[PDB]
């Protein structure tokens, strides 16, 4: 309810968010992948 | 049988309904792997009655836990029995004693 | 050169890891387990009422 | 009384005898307590415990493997296992658990074909339960969407 | 065979980077037409890649140089 | 709650066998068209000309469709 | 998840620290697509249904195929509850007979497991990255220190401690006392001959 | 068991997103480490509180103005032995609390891996490790008074 | 049969050194690994003929606990050094050797007086050391022949020092039993024997001698591929004349060779178009075969 | 000399009973008594051949989880009793025995129809009991030769043929002792006494000779090497 009223936006920067959408977590061996995503984004 | 017990095996075996217990005294007229016929004594019979007790044993039936329920005779032909004696052993019972 | 309890064996493993490294330590641990099992079997240690 | 009964049967009073090793014939160095115990077999049989699965049937809604040996189901990889994989840093193992061994329908069939061809690579994709969650949130009158 | 990866870790400096380099080399040896730089002894491509890294024959810079050289040769010989 | 269980039909089994067969992209599209037009008793419900029309590519002749159909007819069950 | 199983754990005292004992009935199911690929690769099966029927019949050659495909391929063993990251570890399988999983004794402390009814689950990594992560991060030989405090986690216990304590003790008047030996090998030769205590 | 599980779930949720994302933040803040003494017994010596950490300032000898341990030094066993040789009772070290790194911490404000003998690497989920290290021994504590 | 037992078929030998060896035997029947290993270990330790130093006499030493002047090592150190001396004797069952040395340096086995029958395995075996120049060492060494290990404590004039006798050439032997299987049977033994001798004989000869002794002890009771379609010739396919000519020009003679060829390669084959490729795919599909098949090591030397 | 060993040989055999015997080996060198004793004990316990009941067929029964009228035992108990039948076969590796019995009384091993090449060593072995005068039992029993223990699960069959797990080993237990012997004027020679308890279907001397032959054939691999 708070997010819908505020119209919030989620950037998917943590471990749990990337687990929810089935991506590589930004830790361990998935850290370089997110670094490259930041570089190309 | 446990071979080291406490003396409560007979009470558990008999108070449970797994065994066949003589309702009246008499002589084993017929014995078989699936039925027992006892010839009741003349002093325990009712008037105008053929005095015999027929016990049909439970043979290889399924329990609630998908295990086996099976009764085996523990008496021989012609031997005397009295009221309350064990005629057949149920599962986990050895001569009227609990045997787990 | 002493009677090796739990603490002495752990100390031996820690010394091996600190001085030598990882592979000698895992080989040492496996050999320790084998020897301990073998000689515990050979001892015949039992428990009785006496 | 136990020692008296042992003496009646011509047995050592201490209750311990000398044993020999069946593989070498050598006597054990100390006397061993040998006797008789009453053992029970409990209704926990490994026959009912062993269960394995490669693939099988899935749910209609979540498209995830079912549960239970009778249904030939899979093992649940819960939150604590996810935490354990996150503490190791095993990101590819975790992503493989979350999509290809699970409700990601197209990657499921791509991975099997790749494995049969000798190519151990995956194309992860998007889980189906996230789409179900999006639809269920939209059914409440809330506009939730992916962008870019 | 392999029981430990400590030597390869010290060669690369990171476990997280070692996994990526070894996966790249193993995929080159598995799906590509590459041949191992060490004598394969009833080993799988992952263990072969780890043994190649352990001897200093494989790292990120070497892989990048090899890829650039192969691409240049392909583009030169295409005509 | 109730969700149900997925069931494998004849077409699902045939497509599973198609995915694990070395077809080309054109052959795989033809196989998808052929498996689509298979009824519950296992018979082809449309002529091969309809399949060729449904492919939508004009450089394919009936011989390729015939070869792919012959390959599919040897799947499990045979016939 | 797919490619997962579970069963009761027993003890394997012969195993090495990086090895586990996996039933071959479980491994036949868990590694089925790998077996299909290996059967098709060497001409034993020309189609996928032929390989499927060969595996269903459990022919004598599919066991050689399985022993070929499980050679260097880690599996993840996990016991619930997973209180820390040491509740999941990677091992190399050894195909065994029976239905129980054999576990190395020295890793029982990390799992907090004992052999009186505990069950364990096994998962199969599929891709090259997952296999290399299992080998390089989650392997038991990599996990010998506790991440919480830095203490070792491969502490010997019970029978090993009892045996090592018993062998390294001295008695005042024992057989063979007071003799001078050239080295440890002569000591073992005397012990096995029954000439020294 | 249920209370321990709930506690560790909350601890994981609060700190799941904390990762080592840098190598040094250049901060000079720190915490002063002294031996843990309660009443008449020393509960914890100084060595176990500064082992595997990074000094936030130069360590001076107690009797002189001579620099004993320089800045940005990972206190391994040898440094701790040197500190105990000269009777040092308080060392200013770097902690994750006083870290200037935005969205994560650096490898110097954290210190040693405690599973490997070296300094922590970039990309390590230290929050999950911390939550699991705190919550795992919760079944060795007590619930009833 | 009922009297037929398994016999070893994979005998492996690993020569760690000239005196250290590791033997592996498999497969064995269940439980025979322990039987054979224990019997061989007992025979190699307890009953094994050999020659060893029995007793010594030093001219300047009359008591076991004495201090020799000019020699760095103690008396029991010299006894330990003599206990490790390996000697081969061919003449008789008892020999006497004399060692005399003077000067400064390591007194070794090369200083023992030479004899035709007596042979020293290691001439460089160190006996002792002489520190000062004006000191000489003279000793008389008795060597005998026997079996196994005989401690000096079990043998309890003047100046005669007893030495524990190690006649057996075996210095160490250990065995281990692992699991092994034939294709059908899975509970079989695999026996590994690691053994080191003292240099007099090879480890293999020691094992053979032990086995021969054990066997002679029993003399009074012992009574006397690819799927077949892949191997078929390409002529089995009812191909057209042009397609068959192209295939023979491409040196394709077997079905495996054809099914290993992709469509892209066959498209670029000279004199081969699309109709012939489609016909080949049709005739292969009639037998449940395709063109994108991979084989590991196709040509089976046939 | 010292490279020459004294060879043992069988000295005395004492038949304490029909299933219990003592065998004496003499002379032995020092240490060879235990070496021979343990090997012989292991081989005798593990690798001896014998005959066992493998299949049964009773006229009226279809499976072992049933009963028969006039018989006080279940089919499972009868099969367990047959599992302990000791039979010595002297001409073949497989034989079929026939049992027919009627009337009230114990059906024992002496009721099996006599065969020329088959011997029953314990005729008093009770198989079952008939508790009715108009009750009869007829059965066919297959006996095969082998060694070891073969469960029936590991090893088309018509309905009514019952399988029995086969324990082919005739040896019940083995014990051995090493004592001091008086041979010539030597006091360092041993004597090995072996106590064998069996089921009565194997001779002690031939069992010892079979064990020795197996040991020698296993040692022939190390002899050449
Ligand atoms: Mg438990
Ligand atoms: Zn910082």
From Swiss-Prot, chain A:
Co-administration of salinamide and rifampicin or salinamide and myxopyronin suppresses the emergence of resistance to both antibiotics. Belongs to the RNA polymerase beta' chain family. The RNAP catalytic core consists of 2 alpha, 1 beta, 1 beta' and 1 omega subunit. When a sigma factor is associated with the core the holoenzyme is formed, which can initiate transcription. The rRNA transcription and antitermination complex (rrnTAC) consists of RNAP, NusA, NusB, NusE (rpsJ), NusG, SubB, ribosomal protein S4, DNA and precursor rRNA; S4 is more flexible than other subunits. Acetylated on several lysine residues in the presence of glucose. DNA-dependent RNA polymerase (RNAP) catalyzes the transcription of DNA into RNA using the four ribonucleoside triphosphates as substrates. This is DNA-directed RNA polymerase subunit beta'. It comes from the Bacteria.
Swiss-Prot record, chain B:
Co-administration of salinamide and rifampicin or salinamide and myxopyronin suppresses the emergence of resistance to both antibiotics. Acetylated on several lysine residues in the presence of glucose. It comes from the Bacteria. DNA-dependent RNA polymerase (RNAP) catalyzes the transcription of DNA into RNA using the four ribonucleoside triphosphates as substrates. The RNAP catalytic core consists of 2 alpha, 1 beta, 1 beta' and 1 omega subunit. When a sigma factor is associated with the core the holoenzyme is formed, which can initiate transcription. The rRNA transcription and antitermination complex (rrnTAC) consists of RNAP, NusA, NusB, NusE (rpsJ), NusG, SubB, ribosomal protein S4, DNA and precursor rRNA; S4 is more flexible than other subunits. In pull-down experiments interacts with CedA. (Microbial infection) Interacts (via flap domain) with Escherichia phage lambda antitermination protein Q; this interaction renders bacterial RNAP resistant to transcription pausing and allows it to read through termination signals. Belongs to the RNA polymerase beta chain family. This is DNA-directed RNA polymerase subunit beta. The lineage of its organism: Bacteria, Pseudomonadati, Pseudomonadota, Gammaproteobacteria, Enterobacterales. The chain holds residues 697 to 796 of 1342 of the full protein.
Curated annotation (Swiss-Prot), chain E:
SUPFAM superfamilies: RPB6/omega subunit-like. The keyword Nucleotidyltransferase applies. Transmembrane segments: none annotated. The keyword Secreted does not apply. One of its GO terms (cellular component) is transcription elongation factor complex. Gene3D superfamilies: 3.90.940.10. GO terms for biological process: bacterial-type flagellum assembly; bacterial-type flagellum-dependent cell motility; cell motility; cellular response to cell envelope stress; DNA-templated transcription initiation; intracellular iron ion homeostasis; nitrate assimilation; protein-containing complex assembly. Coiled coil: none annotated. Keywords: DNA-directed RNA polymerase, Nucleotidyltransferase, Transcription, Transferase. It catalyses: RNA(n) + a ribonucleoside 5'-triphosphate = RNA(n+1) + diphosphate. One of its GO terms (molecular function) is DNA-directed RNA polymerase activity. Its EC number is 2.7.7.6. It is an enzyme of class 2 (transferase). The RNAP catalytic core consists of 2 alpha, 1 beta, 1 beta' and 1 omega subunit. When a sigma factor is associated with the core the holoenzyme is formed, which can initiate transcription. The rRNA transcription and antitermination complex (rrnTAC) consists of RNAP, NusA, NusB, NusE (rpsJ), NusG, SubB, ribosomal protein S4, DNA and precursor rRNA; S4 is more flexible than other subunits. Belongs to the RNA polymerase subunit omega family. This is DNA-directed RNA polymerase subunit omega. The gene is rpoZ.
Curated annotation (Swiss-Prot), chain J:
DNA-dependent RNA polymerase (RNAP) catalyzes the transcription of DNA into RNA using the four ribonucleoside triphosphates as substrates. This subunit plays an important role in subunit assembly since its dimerization is the first step in the sequential assembly of subunits to form the holoenzyme. Part of the processive rRNA transcription and antitermination complex (rrnTAC). The complex forms an RNA-chaperone ring around the RNA exit tunnel of RNAP. It supports rapid transcription and antitermination of rRNA operons, cotranscriptional rRNA folding, and annealing of distal rRNA regions to allow correct ribosome biogenesis. GO terms for cellular component: cytoplasm; cytosol; cytosolic DNA-directed RNA polymerase complex; membrane; transcription elongation factor complex. The N-terminal domain is essential for RNAP assembly and basal transcription, whereas the C-terminal domain is involved in interaction with transcriptional regulators (such as CRP) and with upstream promoter elements. Coiled coil: none annotated. One of its GO terms (biological process) is nitrate assimilation. The chain holds residues 4 to 234 of 329 of the full protein. The keyword DNA damage does not apply. (Microbial infection) ADP-ribosylated on both alpha subunits by the phage T4 protein ModA. ADP-ribosylated on only one of the alpha subunits by the phage T4 protein Alt. The gene is rpoA. The keyword Transferase applies. It catalyses: RNA(n) + a ribonucleoside 5'-triphosphate = RNA(n+1) + diphosphate.
């Amino acid at each position: 309810t708070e997010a819908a009223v505020a119209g919030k936006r989620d950037e998917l920067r943590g471990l749990k968010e990337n687990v929810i959408v089935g991506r590589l977590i930004p830790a361990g061996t998935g850290y370089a992948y997110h670094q490259d995503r930041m570089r190309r984004r | 049988k446990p071979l080291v017990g406490t003396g409560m095996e007979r009470a558990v075996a008999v108070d449970s309904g797994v065994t066949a217990v003589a309702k009246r005294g008499g002589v084993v007229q017929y014995v078989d792997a699936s039925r027992i016929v006892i010839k009741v004594n003349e002093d325990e019979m009712y008037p105008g009655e053929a005095g015999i007790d027929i016990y049909n044993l439970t043979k290889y039936t399924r329990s609630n836990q998908n295990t086996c329920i099976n009764q085996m005779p523990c008496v021989s032909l012609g031997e005397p029995v009295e009221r309350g004696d064990v005629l057949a052993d149920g599962p986990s019972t050895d001569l009227g004693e609990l045997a787990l | 050169n002493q009677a090796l309890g739990k603490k002495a064996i752990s100390k031996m493993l820690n010394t091996c890891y600190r001085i030598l490294g990882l592979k000698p330590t895992v080989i040492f641990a496996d050999q320790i387990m084998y020897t301990g099992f073998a000689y515990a079997a050979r001892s015949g240690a039992s428990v009785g009422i006496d | 009384e136990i020692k008296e009964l042992l003496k009646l049967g011509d047995l050592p009073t201490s209750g311990q005898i000398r044993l020999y090793d069946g593989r070498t014939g050598e006597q054990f160095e100390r006397p061993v307590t040998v006797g008789y115990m009453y053992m029970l077999k409990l209704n926990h049989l490994v026959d009912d415990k062993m269960h394995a699965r490669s693939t099988g049937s899935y749910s209609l809604v979540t498209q995830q493997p079912l549960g239970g040996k009778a249904q030939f189901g899979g093992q649940r990889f819960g939150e604590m296992e996810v935490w354990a994989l996150e503490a190791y840093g095993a990101a590819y193992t975790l992503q493989e658990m979350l999509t290809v061994k699970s409700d990601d329908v197209n990657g499921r069939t791509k991975m099997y074909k790749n494995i049969v061809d000798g190519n151990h690579q995956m194309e992860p994709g998007m889980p189906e339960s996230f789409n179900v969650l999006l639809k269920e949130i939209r059914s409440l009158g809330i506009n939730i969407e992916l962008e870019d | 065979a392999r029981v430990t990866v400590q030597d390869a870790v010290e060669k690369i400096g990171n476990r997280f980077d070692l996994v990526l380099v070894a996966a790249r080399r193993a995929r080159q040896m598995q799906v590509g037409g590459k041949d191992p730089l060490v004598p394969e002894e009833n080993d799988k491509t992952t263990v072969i890649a780890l043994r190649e890294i352990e001897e200093g024959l494989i790292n990120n810079q070497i892989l990048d140089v090899r890829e650039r050289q192969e691409q240049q040769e392909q583009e030169a010989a295409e005509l | 709650v109730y969700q149900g269980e997925t069931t494998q039909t004849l077409q699902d089994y045939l497509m599973w066998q198609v995915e694990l067969t070395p077809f080309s992209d054109t052959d795989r599209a033809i196989a998808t068209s052929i498996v689509d037009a298979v009824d519950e008793t296992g018979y082809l419900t449309v002529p091969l000309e309809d399949i060729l029309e449904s492919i939508g590519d004009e450089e394919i002749d009936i011989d390729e469709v015939e070869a792919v159909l012959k390959r599919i007819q040897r799947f499990d069950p045979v016939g | 998840v797919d490619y997962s199983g579970r069963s009761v754990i027993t003890v394997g005292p012969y195993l090495r620290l990086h090895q586990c004992g996996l039933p071959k009935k479980m491994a036949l199911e868990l590694f089925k697509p790998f077996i299909y690929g290996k059967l098709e690769l060497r001409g034993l099966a020309t189609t996928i249904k032929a390989a499927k029927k060969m595996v269903e019949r459990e022919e004598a050659v599919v066991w050689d195929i399985l022993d070929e495909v499980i050679r260097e391929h880690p599996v993840l063993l996990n016991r619930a509850p997973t209180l820390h990251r040491l509740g999941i570890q990677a091992f190399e399988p050894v195909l065994i007979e029976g239905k129980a999983i054999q576990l190395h004794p020295l890793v029982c402390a990390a799992y907090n497991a004992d052999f009186d009814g505990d069950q364990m689950a096994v998962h199969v990594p599929l891709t090259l990255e997952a296999q290399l992560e299992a080998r390089a991060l989650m392997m038991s030989t990599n996990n010998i220190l506790s991440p919480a405090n830095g203490e070792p986690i491969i502490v010997p216990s019970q029978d090993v401690v009892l045996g090592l304590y018993y062998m390294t003790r001295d008695c005042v008047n024992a057989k063979g006392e007071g003799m001078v030996l050239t080295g440890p090998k002569e000591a073992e030769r005397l012990y096995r001959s029954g000439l020294a205590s | 068991t249920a209370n321990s599980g709930y506690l560790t779930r909350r601890l994981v949720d609060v700190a799941q997103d904390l990762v080592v994302t840098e190598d040094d933040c250049g901060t000079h803040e720190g915490i002063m480490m002294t031996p843990v003494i309660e009443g008449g017994d020393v509960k914890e010596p100084l060595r176990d509180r500064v082992l595997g950490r990074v000094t936030a300032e130069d360590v001076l000898k107690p009797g002189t103005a001579d620099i004993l341990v320089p800045r940005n030094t990972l206190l391994h066993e040898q440094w701790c032995d040197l500190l105990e040789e000269n009777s040092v009772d308080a060392v200013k070290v770097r902690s994750v609390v006083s870290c200037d790194t935005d969205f994560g911490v650096c490898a110097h404000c954290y210190g040693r891996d405690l599973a490997r003998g070296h300094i922590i690497n970039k990309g390590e989920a230290i929050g999950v490790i911390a939550a699991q290290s705190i919550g795992e021994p919760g079944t060795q504590l007590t619930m009833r008074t | 049969s009922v009297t037929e037992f398994l016999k070893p078929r994979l005998v492996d030998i690993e020569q760690v050194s000239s005196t250290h060896a590791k033997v592996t035997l498999e497969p064995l029947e269940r439980g025979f690994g322990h039987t054979l290993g224990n019997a061989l270990r007992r025979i190699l330790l307890s009953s094994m003929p050999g020659c060893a130093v029995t007793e010594v006499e030093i001219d300047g030493v009359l008591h076991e606990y004495s201090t020799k002047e000019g020699v760095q090592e103690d008396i029991l150190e010299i006894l330990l050094n003599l206990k490790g001396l390996a000697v081969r004797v061919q003449g008789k069952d008892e020999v006497i050797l004399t060692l005399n040395k003077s000067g400064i340096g390591p007194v070794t086995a090369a200083d023992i007086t030479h004899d035709g029958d007596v042979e020293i395995v290691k001439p460089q075996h160190v006996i002792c050391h002489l520190t000062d120049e004006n000191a000489s060492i003279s000793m008389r060494i008795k060597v005998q022949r026997g079996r196994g290990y005989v401690p000096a404590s079990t043998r309890i004039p003047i100046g005669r020092l007893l030495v524990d006798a190690c006649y057996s050439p075996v210095e160490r032997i250990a065995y281990n039993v692992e699991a092994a299987r034939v294709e059908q049977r899975t509970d079989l033994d695999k026996l590994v024997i690691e053994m080191e001798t003292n240099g007099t004989i090879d480890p293999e000869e020691a094992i053979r001698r032990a086995a021969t002794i054990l066997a002679e002890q029993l003399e009074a009771f012992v009574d006397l591929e690819f799927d077949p379609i892949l191997l078929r010739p390409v002529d089995d396919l009812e191909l057209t004349v042009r397609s068959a000519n192209c295939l023979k020009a491409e040196a394709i003679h077997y079905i495996g060779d054809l099914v290993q060829r992709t469509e892209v390669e066959l498209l670029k084959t000279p004199n081969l178009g699309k109709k012939s490729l489609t016909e080949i795919k049709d005739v292969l599909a009639s037998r449940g075969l395709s063109l994108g098949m991979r084989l590991e090591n196709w040509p089976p030397a046939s």
